[PDB]
């Protein structure tokens, strides 16, 4: 009997759930892990190699 019950009449466990989800999220990353990641890409460096 949990129709309106997300967690079956807890009235608690949220005060630590916020901490667990903070820790779990902060150890997986720091950005928003609910959206797709954009990609910036670099190009290797090069120098003058021909005979000076």
């Amino acid at each position: 009997q949990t129709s309106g019950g997300p967690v079956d009449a807890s009235s608690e466990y949220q005060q630590e759930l916020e901490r667990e989800l903070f820790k779990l999220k902060q150890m997986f990353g720091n950005a928003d892990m609910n959206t797709f990641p954009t990609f910036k890409f670099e190009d290797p460096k090069f120098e003058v190699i021909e005979k000076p």
């Binding site: 989800l21 779990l24 999220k25 997986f28 990353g29 892990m33 797709f36 990641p37 990609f39 890409f41 670099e42 190009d43 290797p44 090069f46 190699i49």
Partner: protein, 54 residues
């Protein structure tokens, strides 16, 4: 004569400098590509398992 012909054999060997660099230009562009592949693959996989973890 023997000294001069030795120099010619050496001149003919000169080409090894240019292929070496060409090899390094070849491999580097191959590396940065494969890194770009693993980076993109691994990141998107991370967001997936995070949903699985939470």
């Amino acid at each position: 004569i023997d000294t001069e012909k030795s120099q010619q054999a050496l001149v003919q060997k000169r080409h090894y400098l240019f292929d070496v660099q060409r090899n390094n230009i070849a491999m580097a562009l191959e590396v940065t590509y494969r890194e770009r592949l693993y980076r993109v693959y691994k990141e998107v996989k991370n967001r997936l398992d995070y949903h699985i973890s939470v």
